[PDB]
From Swiss-Prot, chain A:
Subunit and partners: The 26S proteasome consists of a 20S proteasome core and two 19S regulatory subunits. The 20S proteasome core is composed of 28 subunits that are arranged in four stacked rings, resulting in a barrel-shaped structure. The two end rings are each formed by seven alpha subunits, and the two central rings are each formed by seven beta subunits. The catalytic chamber with the active sites is on the inside of the barrel.
GO CC, any one term: cytosol
PANTHER family registered for this protein in UniProt: METALLOPROTEASE TLDD (PTHR32194), PROTEASOME SUBUNIT BETA TYPE-1 (PTHR32194:SF2)
Keywords per UniProt: Cytoplasm, Nucleus, Proteasome
Gene: PRE7
Protein species of origin: Saccharomyces cerevisiae (strain ATCC 204508 / S288c)
Name of this chain's protein: Proteasome subunit beta type-6
Family classification: Belongs to the peptidase T1B family.
Annotated InterPro entries: Ntn_hydrolases_N, Proteasome_bsu_CS, Proteasome_sua/b, Proteasome_suB-type
Cellular localisation: Cytoplasm; Nucleus
Curated annotation (Swiss-Prot), chain B:
Assigned keywords, A-Z: Cytoplasm, Hydrolase, Nucleus, Protease, Proteasome, Threonine protease, Zymogen
Active site: residue positions: 1 (nucleophile)
Reaction it catalyzes: Cleavage of peptide bonds with very broad specificity
A GO term from the CC aspect: proteasome storage granule
Family statement: Belongs to the peptidase T1B family.
Record text on subunit structure and interactions: The 26S proteasome consists of a 20S proteasome core and two 19S regulatory subunits. The 20S proteasome core is composed of 28 subunits that are arranged in four stacked rings, resulting in a barrel-shaped structure. The two end rings are each formed by seven alpha subunits, and the two central rings are each formed by seven beta subunits. The catalytic chamber with the active sites is on the inside of the barrel.
Protein name, entry field: Proteasome subunit beta type-2
Curated annotation (Swiss-Prot), chains D, I:
Keywords: Acetylation, Cytoplasm, Nucleus, Phosphoprotein, Proteasome
Naturally occurring in which organism (per UniProt): Saccharomyces cerevisiae (strain ATCC 204508 / S288c)
SUPFAM superfamilies linked: N-terminal nucleophile aminohydrolases (Ntn hydrolases)
Name of the protein described by the UniProt record: Proteasome subunit beta type-4
Gene it is expressed from: PRE1
Subcellular location: Cytoplasm; Nucleus
Assembly: The 26S proteasome consists of a 20S proteasome core and two 19S regulatory subunits. The 20S proteasome core is composed of 28 subunits that are arranged in four stacked rings, resulting in a barrel-shaped structure. The two end rings are each formed by seven alpha subunits, and the two central rings are each formed by seven beta subunits. The catalytic chamber with the active sites is on the inside of the barrel.
Swiss-Prot record, chain F:
Domain of life, per lineage: Eukaryota
Protein name as it appears in the record: Proteasome subunit beta type-5
Predominant place of localization: cytoplasm
GO cellular component: cytosol; nucleus; peroxisome; proteasome complex; proteasome core complex, beta-subunit complex
Record EC number: 3.4.25.1
Interval of the full protein contained in this chain: 76 to 287 of 287
Length: 222, 222, 196, 195, 125, 212, 233, 204, 195, 196
């Protein structure tokens, strides 16, 4: 019997700072035990300072990104070139996903950008459109490896102030873009070591009020 | 697993990668897939990890007793016969896919064994999930009348093909050279082309970060 | 596999391709499917590689122990031992074996043993997946009391066609000649047999 | 859902229906009224698949009320029961059938007679002196076969009904949290509060 | 399907078909509504050129839409039945979804909406 | 999930956890499972996250359209029935929802309706919904009286979620409290179980099964 | 929902400094039966694109007709049909990719794996893959079926990343492709000896080579291999 | 009905400078229902420590079995078993049940008393040995533990620092797993002193 | 079978076990004692597969009584619980495993302490202050988490137990016909007749 | 079935056995599997009897309507109509059809259409269950530009062998000759072809 779904592997990661947000993802694309491409990007600039990735089944991932990009285009046409805010983009994507509730897009979607107060924003979606704004989210094959590390290092979970008898928590604070990229790179190299579907390369898209910048780093190719 | 075996002028060489997986997770980054059956008979193993270890140890044990009984150095065909009959008896349920090689009074030998009990003879062989990547290299570069150094190069190149192109294989290349008239030389981590890069950050915690409820001394003495 | 054995004036010749598969992958392109159970009693193997090897090994053991006690076994006897194993373990075996040997009294003889474990003595026998494509050709071309050169050409042309159509067959054409003169091994490479 | 009973006596029809609504390992409610008034002298109790029951009951209720307003007239219990049966008989060959079993208790004012109809989800209608749906019947039918008389009073019918509930409370595996009892007679429909 | 636009504007900005429908109302028997401090009374004329009538069965001029709302009319009698039927169905549909009977304003708004739809739909008067 | 809502002398209490799961994977610890439909209406979410989230925000749009058309806030009964009739149309298609529509109106007073994806709709004083509903019931039922003070009722709702968060593996994160009065709903904070458990254990003297 | 009947095996390809090379054998298999031997599985579109197709052959012939029609439709009311408004490889791919994904979404796929190789108008090499699932990807080397397992490793030794492409000549690239085709003939049970090869160069244009054969094979060592373990004669 | 994830739990081990650490959670449940918050998964036979995750009945059985075997070992050998030797015993014992295995994920940790070398090892359910320089993980949050360890770990940590690293590895991994947590225990092991610490963690 | 509970307080272990035996749609008995005395200061309650339960209970009882006679000595609750666990741990890989879940309440006379052990059919043993098997735990555990204190008296334990039974009688789908309550302390085992 | 069509110097000849089955029962031993879709465009049918008949009927209708408007259709056109039906209804059809016709410009032509609905133009084509047994023979014996008598003998000998081995084939060998001269029907009975 024909199976319309497939698994293209890879993993993605979104972190939000005070005045910026990053959306990272490895560039490896796979089926079963073969590598299809060592460089096939899956993090995209969708306009209006919104970056997006839909990781899992690449055909669905591409289709969704394609449709959202097109949604941004028509939002301009219909509402006098108004900028699509990240919260509005999130709600729109929910409807794109839930529209196929009974034949889902097999993807874990993350978008990143800035909210209307200029602060960093990351939204994450399940395959059928359930969404939530967070400081932090990993998605895809190695999400289970990376996410707990993010809880510890971004949100300072389980970390208490030394000598306070485990009574005073380590206080929450925004991270600099330099600190965030360090965590992203360490997250992906760690994931590369222990997950076979993660490697080859790492592409990070950084979003500030000035626009969308890119950074690329080699990952292990085994 | 990727594993290979290559015959040359005055003996035989085998090689293997060092990745061990549990689904998509790398359980062991540097496991030993080259097994000693007797001093000059070695076995490369793919398949179920515990099976290749256990069946190689059992036959190795019985080969040692046989060698002592007969006052003779063990032959590769004896290990071949004992392994295949054991595996056939278990109708494939013992998932061991082996490349058996070595030197004995009869000469130098290279064989392969499938989990179900079939054996092959050849000048070059490859088994495991990366066997197609390896065999592609072997079919491209193998020739009659290889030297020792040529055969090592060909064998390790065939393993590398697996390391880079097969997600089931990774990390390092182990090699074992069995030459006639000489001691077998086991080359553990002959190549290490997958060294982890320096981490961006030290995650050493301030002492007292973890909240503690109780302390106590444990008694290990009598 | 494509395999066959053919009797002729001076004895019998066995023939086989050299391909072993797992699915569509060729696990071995230089396999030897012609296999000695006694000096001048050989067999062609088809079906499960593990099963046919395990069977041939047991038969070779049985005939070696036979020879120690009662001297050279007949080709019929060898076929009977194959049958006994194939028949009694039919539920757990996938083996299609052709048994061929040379006596001085009986000259060349061929026995084929299909899946069920039945025995069939024939002037010639074909078996394996590729045999289906040459039933027509072999029936039209086989003659009794052929010469050595004629029988070699018959097997060469036959297996060439079996190989051409069957994806599960290929590589080299191996042959083993069984006569009073002794045992001769022949090999024929693609470049020769493909353009026949 | 689960337990719905009905008894027709001399001058009235009495319906008893369990109060429990259970989902999984939890009794979500113990005061559920598994009945709808279709007209002033016609009452329908129901049991079956979750959701289907109330949806079907209220759909019938709306249709009968629509008829009442259109004609300024109350349909007979027989007429209502036949309408209900046909709706279920249509339903059973639909893409998704209503899985609802009903009892219809009514007082025919033209005949001055009580009437009780038992209809299952297939659209199987029967008029009965006493009726039950589901596993309840396996206890109550034989009990009523013994103790029921056709000339009983409403009070005698209620005592006869108490005997059924007692038996069910003794031998039924599940706790159905008692019953709501309603009487249908010449003066319409009223609920017994202390049962 | 019959598509003709029967209700259309004229040069002076009138929809004659709607205005001619008002003439049909003007021809109909008189109906009056008066509301008091604690009641509403609906009075209706019945023309007396019809003797030998059977008043038991003859359609009454005042119709119950629900148990708490009534509707009387003036104009074409056959037309009124269609409006009354739709109103009665909407009354029950409202009770079904909202779990509350219609307000008089809501029921009126529905009936008026139906009438309006028939002034800019093709193929209908 | 674990969610509850109960009625008492001083109105309605609504309490929920904040965990989302994908099998044994804890996906989130900060999910909003209460949706604020209007200043007098609340909706709780249990089951499929998308299903609940999508259709309850859709419900909010239908409630807004009602008050535009009717010039009056929708009744709790009518709001709940819009949702129940919607899911009944999808019955069999595989929607997974356990919801509670809570609110106050003049004609109804404080009202709670249970609505689930197989079309069940129930008015009631107390309900607990979700994988940890039984744990919440155990504490809530054994301490419930109608005459609870607003202060005591808020705590009992909070304590019942905590009970379930502790025992049910698929409940946890934090407690979100709400109080519904004649004047509308009032938010009573997000309470992380990380701190709330130990605070309750110490002050109350409960949770003796746990290593202190 | 389908099952493939007459099938074509590996399509292999790679980029080199000035263009792309693509190859595929001339076999139409019918299960294990090697049924048809004159099957061309490389289809040129214009003078700048070659589409290589594996999988179901009836679906391949349907795709041929679609591409043939696309050329016709593009020429309509188009004075620049053989110039600026000629069909680019990237247009041809996106069209096929759209069709493939739409067909999978209707649960009635075209049972194929497709590689579109060509050169864009600005001289850029184009090489991209698409299959029955609508999955698309690009890489310096691309291959389908067994080619993915056996050819890619060999071709990746020549061009392992982007920077290796300018360093690779057409002579070196073709040599690697031809070698890979030989290896597939050794090891793929549904391959044939006869194949076609196409080169799309930004300077010399489209060169289509038919009736190529695998040659310089190693079989001699087979004579030395006897038995399966212990046998000596 | 997947034996290895009915009860839940995790174990992790790490090496440091002249020391080893092994830690486990305290939860024992029956799928969603948490039953016990006192169920320790680490045991020791002399100076050799063994942690076991998976099906709780097999955890208890194997503990009792290895206590049995190490007690007889000591009587006959007249010495305590070493980690390398005990590792081999665990592997043999598990492979003995090859086609009807104990549904467990054991982890050996300890210091060889002769050489002084820190030693850790892990096993699958049928005994395959997984030796490591750095860390071994096991249980229903093994993915999480792999991610935590692979990023947090560095070589040659001092006992007091190693405690922080392994504790943070366990805690944050446990909080992303529904079936792990409900308390935690950490063993710090030096050549001739062992300290056992109970960690404060969230109880949901 | 179905409901078995256990509470360990300061000086005693209290076991409560449902009285109903249901087969199909019939409650066959409403006075069933789902317990066996293993020794003078050790009591075992049980629940699970029909037949298996009593067969297993009595088999354990025989073995402990055999031990008692042989050694003229009473095994500790800990020793008995470990014996029982091993028997179940053997059973689970048999051709036909015992599908029985047990609670073992005992008073250790050497330690002067009450002890409660919960063991499931897999052979999963835990010592607990309060325990339950089956669906009962889904209500009682959270309830006891709130109201239980370690220093409670036997009377306080009985009131705490009444609170559990009340909750189960309110929210459980099935009628389990109340419970038989037994107390295990320094003076042995006795049954509360009025519960 | 065993069926085939062979081009030669003067045109093309179609051939077929005459056996139809339900399981091992022969429902018809004198079937006519050679079928006219146009004056000099015929087809050989294999697979489901109902499917191939329904298809042939539709094609004959299409070509009749073609002829009314545009004159004589080409053999290629006829094959395209067969393909269109077979391809678009592949999920619901079990039909293996060989199309053969004679033009004066194009002379003899043969198109084979297997299960999937693909089209293949060949010098000769074989199909049906019995074709498997004569791939070897037909490949070895076919020559281009044969005479009428040679082509008849080639088909007769080929189908004789296909019939001999395939249980699903048998009865008489029907043949239809398509040349400029016209249309000739040939029949050959068991007594002749069996002893070839
Ligand atoms: K290994
Ligand atoms: Mg690799
Ligand atoms: Mg009935
Ligand atoms: Mg929890
Ligand atoms: Mg085991
Ligand atoms: Mg025949």
């Amino acid at each position: 019997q024909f199976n319309p779904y497939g698994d293209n592997g890879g993993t993605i990661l979104g972190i939000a700072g005070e005045d910026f947000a990053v959306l990272a993802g490895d560039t490896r694309n796979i089926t079963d035990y073969s590598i299809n491409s060592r460089y096939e990007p899956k993090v995209f600039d969708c306009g209006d300072n919104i970056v997006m990735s839909a990781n899992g089944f690449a055909a669905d991932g591409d289709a969704l990104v394609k449709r959202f990009k097109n949604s941004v285009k028509w939002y301009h046409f219909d509402h006098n070139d108004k900028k699509l805010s990240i919260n509005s983009a999130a709600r729109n994507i929910q409807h794109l996903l839930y529209g196929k509730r009974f034949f889902p897009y097999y993807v874990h979607t993350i978008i990143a950008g800035l909210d209307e107060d200029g602060k960093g924003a990351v939204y994450s979606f399940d395959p059928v459109g359930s969404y939530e704004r967070e400081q932090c989210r990993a998605g895809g094959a190695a999400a289970s490896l990376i996410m707990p590390f993010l809880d510890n290092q971004v949100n300072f979970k389980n970390q208490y102030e030394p000598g306070t008898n485990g009574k005073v928590k380590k206080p929450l604070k925004y991270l600099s873009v330099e600190e965030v990229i360090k965590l992203v790179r360490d997250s992906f190299t760690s994931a590369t070591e222990r997950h076979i579907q993660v490697g080859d390369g790492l592409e990070i898209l950084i979003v500030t009020k000035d626009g969308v910048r890119k950074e690329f780093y080699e990952l292990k190719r085994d | 697993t990727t594993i290979v075996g290559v015959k040359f002028n005055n003996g035989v060489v085998i090689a293997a990668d060092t990745r061990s997986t549990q689904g998509p997770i790398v359980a062991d980054k540097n496991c030993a897939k080259l097994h000693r059956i007797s001093p000059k008979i070695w076995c490369a193993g793919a398949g179920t990890a515990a099976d290749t270890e256990a069946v190689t140890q059992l036959i190795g044990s019985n080969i040692e007793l046989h060698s002592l009984y007969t006052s003779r150095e063990p032959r590769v065909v004896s290990a071949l016969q004992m392994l295949k009959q054991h595996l056939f008896k278990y109708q494939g349920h013992i998932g061991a896919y082996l490349i058996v090689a070595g030197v004995d009074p009869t000469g130098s030998h290279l064989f392969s064994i499938d989990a179900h009990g079939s054996t092959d003879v050849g000048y070059y062989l490859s088994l495991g999930s990366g066997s197609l990547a390896a065999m592609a290299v072997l079919e491209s570069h193998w020739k009659q009348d290889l030297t020792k150094e040529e055969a090592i190069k060909l064998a390790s190149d065939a393993i590398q093909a697996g390391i880079w192109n097969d997600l089931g294989s990774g990390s390092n290349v182990d090699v074992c050279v069995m030459e006639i008239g000489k001691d077998a030389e086991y080359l553990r981590n002959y190549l290490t082309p997958n060294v982890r890069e320096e981490k961006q950050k030290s995650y050493k915690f301030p002492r007292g970060t973890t909240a503690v409820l109780k302390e106590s001394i444990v008694n290990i003495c009598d | 596999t494509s395999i066959m054995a053919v009797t002729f004036k001076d004895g019998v010749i066995l023939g086989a391709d050299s391909r072993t598969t797992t699915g569509a992958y060729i696990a071995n392109r230089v396999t030897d499917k012609l296999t000695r159970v006694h000096d001048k009693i050989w067999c062609c193997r088809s079906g499960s590689a593990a099963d046919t090897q395990a069977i041939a090994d047991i038969v070779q053991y049985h005939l070696e122990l036979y020879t120690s006690q009662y001297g050279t076994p007949s080709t019929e006897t060898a076929a009977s031992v194959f049958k006994e194993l194939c028949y009694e373990n039919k539920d757990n075996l996938t083996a299609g074996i052709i048994v061929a040997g040379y006596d001085d009294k009986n000259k060349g003889e061929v026995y084929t043993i299909p899946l069920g474990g039945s025995v069939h003595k024939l002037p010639y026998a074909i078996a394996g997946s590729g045999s289906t494509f040459i039933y027509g050709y072999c029936d039209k071309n086989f003659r009794e009391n052929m010469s050595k050169e004629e029988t070699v050409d018959f097997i060469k042309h036959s297996l060439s066609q079996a190989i051409k159509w069957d994806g599960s067959s290929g590589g080299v054409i191996r042959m083993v000649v069984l006569t009073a003169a002794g045992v001769e091994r022949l090999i024929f490479y693609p470049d020769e047999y493909e353009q026949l | 859902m689960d337990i719905i009973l009905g008894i027709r006596v001399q001058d009235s029809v009495i319906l008893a229906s369990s109060k429990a609504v259970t989902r999984g390992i939890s009794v979500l409610k113990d005061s559920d009224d598994k009945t709808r008034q279709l007209s002033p002298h016609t009452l329908m109790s129901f049991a079956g698949e979750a959701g289907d029951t109330v949806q079907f009951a209220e759909y019938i209720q709306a249709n009968i009320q629509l008829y009442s307003i259109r004609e300024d007239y109350e349909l007979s219990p027989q007429a209502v029961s036949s309408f209900v049966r046909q709706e279920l008989a249509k339903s059973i060959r639909s893409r998704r059938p209503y899985q609802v079993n009903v009892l219809i208790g009514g007082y025919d004012k033209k005949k001055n007679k009580p009437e009780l109809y038992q209809i299952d989800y297939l659209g199987t209608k029967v008029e009965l002196p006493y009726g039950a749906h589901g596993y309840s019947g396996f206890y109550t039918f034989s009990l009523l076969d013994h103790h029921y008389r056709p000339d009983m009073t409403t009070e005698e019918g209620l005592d006869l009904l108490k005997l059924c509930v007692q038996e069910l409370e003794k031998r039924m595996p599940m706790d159905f949290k008692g019953v709501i009892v309603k009487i249908v007679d010449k003066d319409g429909i009223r609920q017994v509060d202390d049962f | 399907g019959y598509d003709r636009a029967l209700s259309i504007f004229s040069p002076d900005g009138h929809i004659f078909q709607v205005e001619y429908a008002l003439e049909a109302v003007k021809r109909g028997t008189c109906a009056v509504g008066v509301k008091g401090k604690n009641c509403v009374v609906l009075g209706c004329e019945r023309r007396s050129t019809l003797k030998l009538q059977d008043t038991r069965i003859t359609p009454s001029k005042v119709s119950k839409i629900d148990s708490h709302v009534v509707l009387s009319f003036s104009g074409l009698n056959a037309d009124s039945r269609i409006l009354i039927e739709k109103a009665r169905v909407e009354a029950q549909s409202h009770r079904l979804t909202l779990e509350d009977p219609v307000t008089v304003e809501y029921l009126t708004r529905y009936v008026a909406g139906v009438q309006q739809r028939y002034t800019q739909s093709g193929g209908v008067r | 999930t674990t969610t509850l809502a109960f009625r008492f002398q001083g109105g309605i209490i609504v309490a929920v956890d904040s965990r989302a799961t994908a099998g044994n994977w804890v996906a989130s610890q900060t999910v909003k499972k209460v949706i604020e439909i209007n200043p007098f209406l609340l909706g709780t979410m249990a089951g499929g996250a998308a299903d609940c989230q999508f259709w309850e925000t859709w419900l909010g749009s239908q409630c807004r359209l009602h008050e535009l058309r009717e010039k009056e806030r929708i009744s709790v009964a009518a709001a709940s029935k819009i949702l129940s009739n919607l899911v009944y149309q999808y019955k069999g298609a595989g929607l997974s929802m356990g919801t509670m529509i809570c609110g106050y109106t003049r004609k109804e007073g404080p009202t709670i309706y249970y609505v689930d994806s197989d079309g069940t709709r129930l008015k009631g004083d107390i309900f607990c919904v979700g994988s940890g509903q039984t744990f919440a019931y155990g504490v809530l039922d054994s301490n419930y009286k109608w005459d609870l003070s607003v202060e005591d009722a808020l705590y009992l709702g909070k304590r019942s979620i905590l009970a379930a968060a502790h025992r049910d593996a698929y409940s946890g994160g934090s407690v979100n409290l709400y109080h519904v009065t004649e004047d509308g709903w009032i938010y009573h904070g997000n309470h992380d179980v990380g701190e709330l458990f130990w605070k309750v254990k110490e002050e109350e003297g409960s949770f003796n099964n746990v290593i202190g | 929902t389908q099952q493939p009947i007459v099938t074509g095996t590996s399509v292999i390809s790679m980029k080199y400094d000035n263009g792309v090379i693509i190859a595929a054998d001339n076999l139409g298999s019918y299960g294990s039966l090697l049924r048809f031997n004159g099957v061309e599985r490389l289809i040129p579109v214009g003078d700048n694109t070659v589409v290589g197709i594996s999988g179901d052959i009836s679906d391949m012939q349907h795709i041929e007709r679609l591409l043939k029609d696309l050329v016709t439709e593009n020429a309509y009311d188009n004075p620049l049909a053989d110039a600026e408004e000629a069909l680019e490889p990237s247009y041809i791919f996106e069209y096929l990719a759209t069709v493939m994904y739409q067909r999978r979404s209707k649960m009635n796929p075209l049972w194929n794996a497709i590689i579109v190789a060509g050169v864009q108008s600005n001289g850029d090499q184009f090489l991209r893959y698409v299959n029955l699932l609508g999955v698309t990807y690009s890489s310096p080397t691309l291959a389908t079926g067994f080619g993915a397992h056996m050819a890619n490793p060999l071709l990746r030794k020549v061009v392992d990343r982007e920077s290796d492409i300018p360093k690779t000549t057409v002579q070196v690239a073709e040599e690697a492709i031809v070698n890979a085709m030989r290896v597939l003939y050794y090891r793929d049970a549904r391959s044939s000896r006869n194949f076609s090869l196409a080169i799309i160069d930004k300077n010399t244009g489209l060169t289509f080579k038919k009736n190529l054969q695998v040659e310089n094979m190693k079989w001699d060592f087979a004579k030395d291999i006897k038995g399966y373990g212990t046998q000596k004669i | 009905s997947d034996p290895s994830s009915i009860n839940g739990g995790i174990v992790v081990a790490m090496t440091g400078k002249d020391c080893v650490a092994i830690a486990c959670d305290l939860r024992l449940g029956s799928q969603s229902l948490g039953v016990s918050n006192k169920f320790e998964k680490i045991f020791h036979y002399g100076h050799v420590f063994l942690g076991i995750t998976g099906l709780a009945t097999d955890v208890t059985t194997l503990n009792e079995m290895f206590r049995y075997k190490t007690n007889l070992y000591k009587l006959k050998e007249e010495r305590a078993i070493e980690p390398e030797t005990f590792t081999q015993l665990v592997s043999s014992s598990l492979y003995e049940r090859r086609f009807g295995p104990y549904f467990v994920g054991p982890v050996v940790a300890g210091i060889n008393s002769k050489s002084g070398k820190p030693f850790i090892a892990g096993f699958d359910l049928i005994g395959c040995i997984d030796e490591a320089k750095d860390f071994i993980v096991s249980g229903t949050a093994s993915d999480q533990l792999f991610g935590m360890c692979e990023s947090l770990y560095e070589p040659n940590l001092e006992p007091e620092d190693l405690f922080e690293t392994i504790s943070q590895a366990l805690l944050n991994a446990a909080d992303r797993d529904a079936l792990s947590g409900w308390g935690a225990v950490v063993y710090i092991i030096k050549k001739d002193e062992v300290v056992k610490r109970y960690l404060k963690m969230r109880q949901d």
